[PDB]
Design a protein around this ligand. Structure first.
Ligand SMILES: *[C@@H]1[C@H](O)[C@@H](O)[C@H](O[C@H]2O[C@H](COS(=O)(=O)O)[C@@H](O)[C@H](O)[C@H]2NC(C)=O)[C@@H](C(=O)O)[C@H]1O
Length: 439
């Protein structure tokens, strides 16, 4: 008893071109305390990244960049050694991903940041290094006394400039991004205005979960539009118009403080994440970096070098995006969809010339039947993003297969989308996703 909706693809309604390095992950700087983590020896993790994209960005930063200290002299407080940086360069070579690297503006010195930046540029080098960032979420330094309550944008601008100047003496070509926090008017907007000639792009953060006074995030709420996201995105677009700076979402996940068990670690997070990737690409974002590491509730990839790594449910939403590939987004308008309002759809003219459609039936209790118009093709296939329940922590498949070890994945189920009268009809179960590819 599906809700029968229409989807109209318009090849003449041109949207943004998705860049090849749109995908990405965000990790804590403290991972850099174990040189076995981002290492050429970590073949498992490298394979999970390659499956997420042949190009992409690894962002390292997070709150642990308050208390992680580069020590050129070395072989809560964590230490980054030359060997760790050495090994990170090899990991970037194995993955093909670029790097956003956090420096310690919260507790470190400008001179040590210059020295760390110099060694990163010495060993990772300008091609692989996309940006340094000078502190993570500086607007929240006060929450744990990294700064006093009085710390404001002026104070941070003074810190930022001291660090930037010191770094640029050691590393004249050092690239920067900032301010590495969620859009706001008291920090991000003035950062862009003041430092637009000194940064390459704006780095923003986004957690679907709002302030902790909100009702605890639920799967139901995660599937719904987030008006705050829409507003912040519009703010970032206005910043880009005013300053020329593009924006990248350098730390995001469903819920903050490590994720919420029964939301962040579930199949719903795959639907959320995959949809968010497209939503933000359609809005003009240059890319995304889903935060994770360890066995946190929200991590895309869980595990350790000693015990092995696995793909968590959210990974599978990122995998759908990866399998779709890059290209130019096209108009894709839904109709007759008020009874299935959480279905989203995105159409893409792939770089290879083929039309694809990514659909996320985020309606938890409505199946849909989608009548697709605007595509002329002799053959459409679908790969489904599936789990038996929206809150499942396992049992997630894409294309009829789980992801295996080291990011291994290939589709095992072939399904054609029936075509007639120049249209296609696709059924989707409640709480499912689909990637269509047209011949
Ligand atoms: C973005 C932050 O930059 C990121 O560090 C943070 O996630 C980490 O910190 C959380 C809070 O810990 S504490 O209060 O600073 O000690 C912690 O709950 C998360 O587990 C931790 N994440 C990882 C992968 O280690 C996140 C967040 O989840 O809150 C964002 O604030």
């Amino acid at each position: 008893s599906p809700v029968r909706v229409g989807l109209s693809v318009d090849a003449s309604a041109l949207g943004h071109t998705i860049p090849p390095d749109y995908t990405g992950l965000s990790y804590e700087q403290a991972q850099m305390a174990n040189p076995n983590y981002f290492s050429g020896a970590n073949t498992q993790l490298a394979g999970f990244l390659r499956t997420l994209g042949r190009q992409g960005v690894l962002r390292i930063g997070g709150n642990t960049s308050e208390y992680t200290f580069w020590n050129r002299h070395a072989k809560a407080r964590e230490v980054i050694t030359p060997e760790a940086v050495n090994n990170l360069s090899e990991f970037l070579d194995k993955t093909g991903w670029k790097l956003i690297y956090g420096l310690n503006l919260g507790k470190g010195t400008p001179e040590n940041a210059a020295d760390e930046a110099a060694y990163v540029m010495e060993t990772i080098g300008a091609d692989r290094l996309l940006a340094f960032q000078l502190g993570n979420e500086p607007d929240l330094f006060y929450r744990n006394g990294i700064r006093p309550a009085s710390y404001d944008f002026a104070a941070y601008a003074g810190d930022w400039q001291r660090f930037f100047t010191a770094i640029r003496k050691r590393v004249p070509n050092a690239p920067f991004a900032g301010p590495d926090t969620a859009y706001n008017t008291k920090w991000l907007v003035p950062f862009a205005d003041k430092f637009k000639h000194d940064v390459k792009f704006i780095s923003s953060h986004y957690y679907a979960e709002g302030p902790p006074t909100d009702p605890s995030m639920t799967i139901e709420r995660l599937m719904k539009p987030n008006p705050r996201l829409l507003g912040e995105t519009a703010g970032l677009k206005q910043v880009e118009a005013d300053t020329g700076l593009p924006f990248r979402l350098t730390e995001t996940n469903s819920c903050y403080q490590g994720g919420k068990q029964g939301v962040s670690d579930t199949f719903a997070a795959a639907l959320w994440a995959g949809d968010l990737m497209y939503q933000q690409a359609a809005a003009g974002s240059t890319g995304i970096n889903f935060h994770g590491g360890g066995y946190g509730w929200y991590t895309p990839v869980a595990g350790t070098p000693e015990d092995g790594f696995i793909a968590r449910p959210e990974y599978y939403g990122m995998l759908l995006f990866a399998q779709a590939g890059a290209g130019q987004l096209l108009g894709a308008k839904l109709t007759d969809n008020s009874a299935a309002p959480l279905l989203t759809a995105y159409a893409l003219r792939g770089t290879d010339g083929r039309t694809r459609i990514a659909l996320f039936n985020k309606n938890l209790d409505a199946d849909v039947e989608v009548a697709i118009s605007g595509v002329a093709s002799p053959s459409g296939t679908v790969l489904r993003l599936e789990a038996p329940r929206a809150d499942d922590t396992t049992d997630v498949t894409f294309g009829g297969a789980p992801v295996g070890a080291s990011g291994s994945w290939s589709p095992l189920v072939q399904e054609y989308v029936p075509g007639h009268s120049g249209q296609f009809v696709l059924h989707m179960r409640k709480a499912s996703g689909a990637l269509l590819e047209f011949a």
